[PDB]
Amino acid sequence: SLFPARCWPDPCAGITFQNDTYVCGDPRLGPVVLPQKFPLNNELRTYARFGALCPAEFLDKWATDVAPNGTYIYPPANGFALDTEEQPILGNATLPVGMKLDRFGSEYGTFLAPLGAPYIERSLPPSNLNTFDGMYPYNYHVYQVTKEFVVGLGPIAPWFEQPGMGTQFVTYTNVLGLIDDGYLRREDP
Amino acid sequence: SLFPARCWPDPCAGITFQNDTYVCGDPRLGPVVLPQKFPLNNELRTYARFGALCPAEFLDKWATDVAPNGTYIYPPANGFALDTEEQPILGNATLPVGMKLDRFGSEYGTFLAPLGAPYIERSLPPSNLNTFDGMYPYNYHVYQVTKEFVVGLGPIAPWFEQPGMGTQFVTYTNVLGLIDDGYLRREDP
Ligand SMILES: *[C@@H]1O[C@H](CO[C@@H]2O[C@@H](C)[C@@H](O)[C@@H](O)[C@@H]2O)[C@@H](O[C@@H]2O[C@H](CO)[C@@H](O[C@@H]3O[C@H](CO)[C@@H](O)[C@H](O[C@H]4O[C@H](CO)[C@@H](O)[C@H](O)[C@@H]4O)[C@@H]3O)[C@H](O)[C@H]2NC(C)=O)[C@H](O)[C@H]1NC(C)=O
Ligand SMILES: *[C@@H]1O[C@H](CO[C@@H]2O[C@@H](C)[C@@H](O)[C@@H](O)[C@@H]2O)[C@@H](O[C@@H]2O[C@H](CO)[C@@H](O)[C@H](O)[C@H]2NC(C)=O)[C@H](O)[C@H]1NC(C)=O
Ligand SMILES: *[C@@H]1O[C@H](CO)[C@@H](O)[C@H](O)[C@H]1NC(C)=O
Ligand SMILES: *[C@@H]1O[C@H](CO)[C@@H](O)[C@H](O)[C@H]1NC(C)=O
Ligand SMILES: *[C@@H]1O[C@H](CO)[C@@H](O)[C@H](O)[C@H]1NC(C)=O
Ligand SMILES: *[C@@H]1O[C@H](CO)[C@@H](O)[C@H](O)[C@H]1NC(C)=O
């Protein structure tokens, strides 16, 4: 189920091989071995890393180049779902003390999600699944709100062949600042 | 496990026993045997049916009465997350052909969700988990968008001791009329 069935016998057609840790040797396509602590699946919805596309089709559509120097293109309006007038749907909301948040990316960032939200809801590309220890994604962090503060709160638009429709929180201070001023604390999962 | 530890040695204290298929014999508290196909946990969080409350405390807080005639109290503003001005966060959005949706409730209803969203994201009470085939919840329906239509789309507020923060779709005609007119089609899960 790694690749759509149509992509056989040669699913890696068009992909330049860099390092055999990664699918078709390309880190953008995520790891062969997936981090054993994100399950991603249930009986109703499964994680199709490329959607119904084959790997090279997926890179051509969602990156600037299928070649290794291509980079992923991200959605407009900070990835918020768009209303019928093409405006992102969100509002300023207060996060309460005790709430559990997680994040893919460095603490220089400003985007969090609720702890544990399934991957396919986040519309993140495959390379966010790369790991260093097999347990967890290499850029995955978990936090707890320690003092109430206001964020932009709203639904996640579909992208990268994923359905999206989780909720995301866009902070007005980066995570490092929020930790330093006592709004968030780090938790190790 | 099923009940918080402090609730022992008599966790069903205060619950009137009706039928031994249900926890403490109360259908409002959901099935002893949970439907073996349905996604409760999200990725890293497990499903606590009562949160940290004991059963009788849970019904006192979330229902009109602990007695068997008590009915669940639902959140204001259709259960949308509220902004800092106490207004629901949402906008009108066009659902696209091909989108997969599901719903807990009769087709006389107006609320739908992305197919497969984890139960803990929906802020629904435990009795929506009651199952007669043991496989799927009794009131559970799956649909696919066959023609575009506009819904109210937004995040789900925490309620019933659950974290919420899935996305919900509120239709302007009940689900039945969307099916009859070719906007949705029924699917067997
Ligand atoms: C998102 O969309 C909903 C629903 O709008 C309906 O569905 C859409 C898919 C689309 O087809 C729309 O064309 C369609 O209206 C919006 O909710 C509705 O908002 C209207 C007004 O904006 C409400 O109508 C009001 O109803 C009142 C009684 O319940 C009544 O007092 C009002 O009458 C007055 O106003 C009219 C002019 O608007 C005037 O002619 C009258 O004589 C009188 O002065 C008014 O009719 C609906 O009740 C709302 N429907 C629901 C289900 O709530 C929603 O505003 C929109 N949201 C965003 C953010 O765009
Ligand atoms: C949500 O807030 C942002 C940012 O405003 C800051 O945070 C809020 C919680 C509130 O306390 C504000 O007073 C703070 O300044 C709003 O974006 C701002 O919009 C104004 C309007 O032109 C603009 O001058 C600022 O530069 C914007 N700031 C940023 C960081 O973009 C946003 O409009 C608010 N959304 C609402 C109220 O729905
Ligand atoms: C890249 O490939 C080399 C094999 O020469 C391997 O040692 C290394 O671990 C790979 N990089 C990873 C897994 O990040
Ligand atoms: C990326 O590499 C390909 C060659 O493999 C080249 O065609 C393309 O122009 C490159 N883009 C750059 C260097 O920005
Ligand atoms: C309880 O309810 C189920 C279905 O609602 C029914 O099959 C059963 O006979 C009822 N009574 C008992 C004692 O189980
Ligand atoms: C439910 O019935 C009980 C009798 O067992 C009664 O005390 C109570 O008033 C009823 N519920 C409400 C909300 O009135």
Author numbering:
A (entry chain A), B (entry chain B): 27 to 215
What did the authors write?
The majority of cellular NAD+ is generated in the salvage pathway, where the Nam released in signaling reactions is resynthesized into NAD+.4 Given its importance, NAD+ is targeted by toxins from many pathogenic microorganisms, including Streptococcus pyogenes and Mycobacterium tuberculosis. These toxins invade cells and act as NAD glycohydrolases, cleaving NAD+ into Nam and ADPR and rapidly depleting the cellular NAD pool, ultimately leading to cell death. In this context, we recently discovered a new fungal NADase on the surface of conidia from Aspergillus fumigatus (AfNADase), the predominant etiologic agent of Aspergillosis. The catalytic part of the TNT is structurally highly similar to AfNADase. Intriguingly, the active site architecture of the bacterial and fungal enzymes is conserved, but their structural superimposition reveals the presence of a unique C-terminal calcium-binding motif in AfNADase, which is located at the edge of the dimerization interface. In the present study, we addressed the structural and functional role of calcium binding by introducing mutations in the C-terminus of AfNADase that precluded the binding of the metal ion.
In the second variant, we created a chimeric NADase by replacing the 10 C-terminal amino acids, including the Ca2+-binding motif, with the C-terminus from N. crassa NADase (NcNADase). Importantly, NcNADase lacks the calcium binding site and as a result the chimeric protein, here referred to as AfNADase NcC-Term, is predicted to be unable to bind calcium. Compared to the wild-type enzyme, AfNADase NcC-Term showed a 5-fold decrease in affinity and a 66-fold reduced conversion rate (KM of 272.8 ± 48.6 μM and a Vmax of 69.8 ± 5.3 μmol/min/mg). In contrast, AfNADase NcC-Term showed a large shift in TM, from 71.4 to 57.9 °C for the wild-type and NcC-Term, respectively. These data suggest that at least in the AfNADase NcC-Term, the overall stability of the protein is affected by the modification of the C-terminus that eliminates the calcium binding site. The structure was chosen for the analysis based on the hypothesis that it represents a static conformation resembling dimer 2 of AfNADaseD219A/E220A. In line with this suggestion, the AfNADase NcC-Term variant (dimer 2-like), which lacks the ability to form the native-like C-terminal conformation, exhibits substantially decreased catalytic activity and thermostability.
